[PDB]
Amino acid sequence: SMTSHSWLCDGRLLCLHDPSNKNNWKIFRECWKQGQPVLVSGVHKKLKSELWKPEAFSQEFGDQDVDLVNCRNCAIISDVKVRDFWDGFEIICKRLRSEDGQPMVLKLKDWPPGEDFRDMMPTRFEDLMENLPLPEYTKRDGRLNLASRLPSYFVRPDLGPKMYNAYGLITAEDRRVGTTNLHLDVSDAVNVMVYVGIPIGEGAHDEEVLKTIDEGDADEVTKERIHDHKEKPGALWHIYAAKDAEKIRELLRKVGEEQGQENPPDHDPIHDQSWYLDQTLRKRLYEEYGVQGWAIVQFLGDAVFIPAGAPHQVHNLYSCIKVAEDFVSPEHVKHCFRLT
Ligand SMILES: O=C(C1CC1)N1CCN(C(=O)[C@H]2CCCO2)CC1
Ligand SMILES: [Cl-]
Ligand SMILES: [Cl-]
Ligand SMILES: [Cl-]
Ligand SMILES: [Cl-]
Ligand SMILES: [Mn+2]
C-alpha cells in the first residue's frame, strides 16, 4: 500500500514518500525542530528525465573550460574541456588516466560556476525549483525561508542551485576516500539525486558497493531497498548533529597530532574540509567521544535535508548528478547569526 512515510536508521530518520503531498510539513517540522536530517523519496518521477542526462550536458556545454579534482589524491586537473569529464561519466575506457595508467575517479569542480546555474540552464532551473519538496521552506520566496528577509547581522546563502557531479569510487582502497570531505554549512540545504550512472567496461563492480554500504553502518531496511525493489543507489552520506561538531573537532585534533601534523590547539579541522571519517574513525568517534551519526544511502530521486551546522561527508557509490538549494528555516536561524 501507498503510505505517507516510513523510518530509516532504526527510527531516527523520517522518510517521506510523496514529494508533493501538501500535508508533509506536519510530520517534517517535529523532526526538523530536533536537529535531525530528513529524506524525501520519489523526486525523479516529478522531473523531465531528458534534461538530467550526462550526454545532454556534454552536447550543450562540452566546449566550456573547467578544473577537475582527482578524488584519490586531491590533485587538480587544470583548464580542460567539460566534455573530457562528461564523456567518461559511464564509459570507463574514455576516462582521463593517472601516471599508473588506471582510469581516474574525478569530480567536476564549481560547474556551473558561482551563481550562474539559472543564467546557463533556465529550463533545468524551472524543472528543479517547481518540484522541490517542502516548498514553503525550500523555494527562494517560501513563507518559511528567511534567506531574503534577514539583515547583515546574518550570513545569507548565495543564489543557487549548485550542481555536484562526480564519478563513483571503485576499489577496496577507495572505501576510505570521500567525494566531498567532512564540512558544515551555516544555512540549511536540500540535495536532490537527479541521475545515477552505473558504468560499462568494468560493470561487475556491484559487490564492492555492497561491502561499502555494510561497512558504512547502513540499517537493515536501507539494505532491503537494493535487494527487494532494485532502486539505483547513488551515494553514502554520514551526517552528525550540529551539537556534536566540537567533539568531532577534538577527535580530529588528536588524530592530526598522532599522524605528526603540527597544528595550533584551536585550528578547525571541520572548516579545513581535509578529513573523511572511515570505518576506524567513525568507531573511535562513537567509543571515545559518545557521538552517533546517521548513515544515509541516497538513491535516484531521493532529496536529503541537511540541518544548518550539521557536519556531513559524501562518498559516491556510482557516478552521480546532484542539485542542491540552500535555505534559512526559522528552526535553525541561530546557526548563521554573526554575534555571541
Ligand atoms: O550558539 C550557537 C547556536 C547554534 C546554537 N552558534 C554559535 C556559533 N556560530 C557562529 O559562529 C556564526 C558566526 C557567523 C556564522 O556562524 C553560530 C551558532
Ligand atoms: Cl539546531
Ligand atoms: Cl536549460
Ligand atoms: Cl512546505
Ligand atoms: Cl571535499
Ligand atoms: Mn554541504
CA of 136 to the centre of ligand 6 (A): 21
Point out the ligand nearest to the CA of residue 124.
3
Residues in contact with ligand 1 by the CB-under-6-Å rule are: 155, 186, 309, 334-338
Strand partners, 306: 189
**Beta strand 65-70 pairing with 106-108:** antiparallel
Residue nearest to atom 17 of ligand 1 (CA): 335
**Which among 188, 331, 334 is the best mutation to test ligand 1's pocket, defined by most ligand atoms within 8 Å of the CB?**
334
CA of 85 to the centre of ligand 2 (A): 38
* Number of Cβ atoms within 10 Å of the Cβ of 11: 8
Which ligand 1 atom minimizes the distance to the CA of 242?
A: 4
CA of 166 to the centre of ligand 6 (A): 15
**Quick check: 178 and 117 in contact, CB under 8 A?**
no
Question: Nearest to residue 105, comparing CAs of 74, 83, 127, 151?
Answer: 74
Crossing angle, helix 279-289 and helix 245-258, to 10 degrees?
120
| Residues with CB in 5 Å of ion ligand 5 | 180-181
Point out the ligand nearest to the CA of residue 178.
5
| Amino acid residing at 235 | A
- Going along the chain, which residue ranges are E strands? 5-8, 13-16, 38-40, 65-70, 76-81, 106-108, 162-166, 180-183, 188-197, 233-239, 294-299, 303-306, 312-316, 319-327
Strand order in the sheet with 233-239: 180-183, 312-316, 233-239, 294-299
**Beta strand 233-239 pairing with 294-299:** antiparallel
Cell of 242: 550540529
Integer angstrom CA distances of residue 215 from 222, 223, 235, 275: 13, 12, 14, 18
- What burial letters (b/e) apply to 254-269, b meaning 16+ CB within 10 Å? ebbeeeeeeeeeeeeb
Q: Which residues contact 79 (CB under 8 A, 6 or more apart)?
A: 65, 67
As a 3-state breakdown, the chain gives helix, strand, coil percent values, each rounded to 5, of 35, 25, 40
CA of 135 to the centre of ligand 4 (A): 5
**Which among 156, 337, 340 is the best mutation to test ligand 1's pocket, defined by most ligand atoms within 8 Å of the CB?**
337
CA of 333 to the centre of ligand 1 (A): 9
CATH number, span 1-340? 2.60.120.650
